[PDB]
Symmetry: D2
Subunit: 124 residues, 4 copies
């Protein structure tokens, strides 16, 4: 019965925050992503996110992915991971991400993608 | 003058094909992703995708990200890359992807993520 | 003044431990990587590693990469990261890794690579 | 019998070249990596590489990994992949890589790792 659900307010290991609304019945959802550019406490930015969670076998702990469309740069980041209910134990989203920068020349493509992780917990 | 445009029919280096529809003014779009099994010859699965293309500075070669919500498994894949005008004049999407599998215990999280690339060109 | 030094005994966020020996003047080094199975409790496998640490500008927090040649499978893992002095003063290696599995046909290449992270701290 | 062997001279999809010497009986090997920084035809640089190939079940087509210790930067890149003998069909190494940059502050770690691929063919 214990459905790990993406809807709500989350924060992460770098101190960025994220809010995701209601997941409709085809798994779609939208959110906002707020990020720490600086000392962390002054300059904030909001960017939209859009994703889908997988509904195959109505899992507790489904996998999901979403795209963050940076409002302050020409970059795009995509996240994928899984909503786990560890013991008790908050909910926790374990994610991996790819950050695509824009390059002017296709000869620079090879260097345009960063990778990393994010762990998200419910915001308090 | 012409730009690189996600809208249309695409194919890739693995033989999978993808159709993307119109890109609205927020950069959102929807589409379909077809791939195949065995000796790539008969059974074709279709899965929807949703993503966004970065609109910051209305670039001619925009970055973008999308999420593929697999119809036939518990998995999710995210793609991000850039729509280039190649040196030979043809549109190409250079992407990288993260394929997240569903695991059962959070202790298996470590091994749930594959990474790789796809290069898409227009279909005839 | 003290720098961050790969030489020594290390442990990580998954419970695996690693020993690295002396780093010669070319930046080369060797060591051992131990991990475990089931409920992480009894059977420990040991595999050798070899790598190099970047020496350009004799930095105090050098980047490095190493290859783990698994003793118990056909697989290979590579790690790369950086040896930091953390904010709390303790040495930490932040790494990312690519785990390549062996496949049989070149058509399965696409799915042979996992990615993720490990964070190492010194053992007592 | 057809052993895909790392020893030799290779080139890649970006026009970098690589030479690897003899693989000893524990799988170790060393090489040089020559890279195109510019128009491709003028400024060359050589950097050492060191790796191991997996010897578990003496495979044709073993997996391998290696570290390239950049001589002209504080970065490190690691490659992992597999030596395939496709039909006939050259030998071909399909690789993935992680490029670690040096960051001054551990607060920048998250952005320090790029990922991508390289396909290598025997040099002619
Ligand atoms: N992809 C990604 N981007 C991030 C994270 N945190 C963060 O601040 N960013 C911003 C940094 C960069 O300035 C911007 C696009 O260049 O994305 C983050 O965790 N992931
Ligand atoms: N990791 C990696 N690095 C490369 C490749 N090609 C290339 O020229 N480099 C260089 C570029 C960069 O200037 C240097 C270290 O910063 O590594 C490459 O294919 N992979
Ligand atoms: C996240 O939320 C809290 C306020 O509830 C705050 O510490 C911080 O400003 C937020 N982080 C960002 C990047 O805005
Ligand atoms: C992709 O489309 C082409 C039609 O141009 C078709 O020949 C091919 O089999 C398709 N591949 C898949 C997996 O749908
Ligand atoms: C790592 O080392 C510690 C000793 O400090 C031990 O308790 C632990 O079980 C070891 N883990 C493995 C997998 O070797
Ligand atoms: C690779 O080798 C050939 C010469 O055989 C040449 O085209 C090129 O200069 C080499 N590439 C680099 C980066 O040196």
């Amino acid at each position: 019965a214990r459905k790990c659900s993406l809807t709500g307010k989350w924060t992460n290991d770098l101190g960025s925050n994220m809010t995701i609304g209601a997941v409709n019945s085809r798994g779609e959802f939208t959110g906002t992503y707020t990020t720490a550019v600086t000392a962390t406490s002054n300059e904030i930015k909001e960017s939209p996110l859009h994703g889908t969670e997988n509904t195959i076998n109505k899992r507790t702990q489904p996998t999901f992915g979403f795209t963050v469309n940076w409002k302050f740069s020409e970059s795009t980041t995509v996240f994928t991971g899984q909503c786990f209910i560890d013991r008790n134990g908050k909910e926790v989203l374990k994610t991996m991400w790819l950050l695509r920068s824009s390059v002017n020349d296709i000869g620079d493509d090879w260097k345009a993608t960063r990778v990393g992780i994010n762990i998200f917990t419910r915001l308090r």
